[PDB]
């Protein structure tokens, strides 16, 4: 699922609650900076809740955290 | 209540080559 339409780029937008799809991984959260160190051989990570807690950009090499949006 | 996202970010890896 690496090629879909015009959406190949979609320049990143941080510090906002957004529904995101990274390399076929659906999800919605808040994008923030990440001080946690990951192995470059990996892809992403999850928490004990079986939900993705952080992501890695396929193009540029970076670590980003997924913060759950405010709910009630 | 739940906050609804107003924008969608979908980003895919770069294309080195394709499968014809």
């Amino acid at each position, epitope marked *: 699922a690496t090629v879909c339409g015009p959406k190949k780029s979609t*320049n*990143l*937008v*941080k510090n906002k609650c957004v529904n995101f799809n990274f390399n076929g991984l659906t999800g919605t959260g808040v994008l923030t*900076e*990440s*001080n946690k160190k990951f192995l470059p051989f990996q892809q992403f990570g999850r928490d004990i809740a079986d939900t993705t807690d952080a992501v890695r950009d396929p193009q540029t090499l970076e*670590i980003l955290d997924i913060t759950p949006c405010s709910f009630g | 209540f739940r906050v609804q996202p107003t924008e969608s970010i979908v980003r895919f890896p770069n294309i080195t080559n394709l499968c014809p």
Partner: antibody
Amino acid sequence: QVQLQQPGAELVRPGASVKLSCKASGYSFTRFWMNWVKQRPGQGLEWIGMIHPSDSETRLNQKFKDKATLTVDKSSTTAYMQLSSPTSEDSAVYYCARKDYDYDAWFAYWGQGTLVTVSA
Amino acid sequence: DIVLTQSPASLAVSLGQRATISCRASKSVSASVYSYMHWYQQKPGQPPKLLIYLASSLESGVPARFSGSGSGTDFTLNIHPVEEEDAATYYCHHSRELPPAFGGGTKLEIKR
């Protein structure tokens, strides 16, 4: 080509209101953030706040909290900024800069600038 | 939040020498084996411009005589060779924590 435009200067009397226009061209206005920077000569740089044109949500400094006011017009793709009772201490040049995101965030583009002077 | 401190407030560098400007931060902005810093060049009557992003990469369109790097809270901006067109005020920035803050600024003087 991405280009930003602002008026040259604006005059205001103490106690009145101000309106600053920032015109966007060559890119989607609602997708990216819009930041305002306060340059007071001799005081260096100061950060005002950002606004997201989509939902009209604002992140404002506590120093400018309750004073500055942000709003956007999605029809003409023009961002506005308003100040409450500009005083002599509020006279300065204001820029509207695009914030581009590749990993870390930096300011790629800037506005022509608008000189604000409060006098009778 | 995070506050930036630059010293000296003004620097005078002649032609051919090397210019060193330090941007000190209150807390460490380094994350993911990267750090958040940006340098800006402003001239009188002109808006600031982008010089070097993430300290490790030179922006397209900027001459190669500008360089820099650093780790932790103390980063340096190196200039060599110095030219007559380099006179300006410089600024450092951090996007690490909201709200972002702006550097104090440093005025550059060219000796001759």
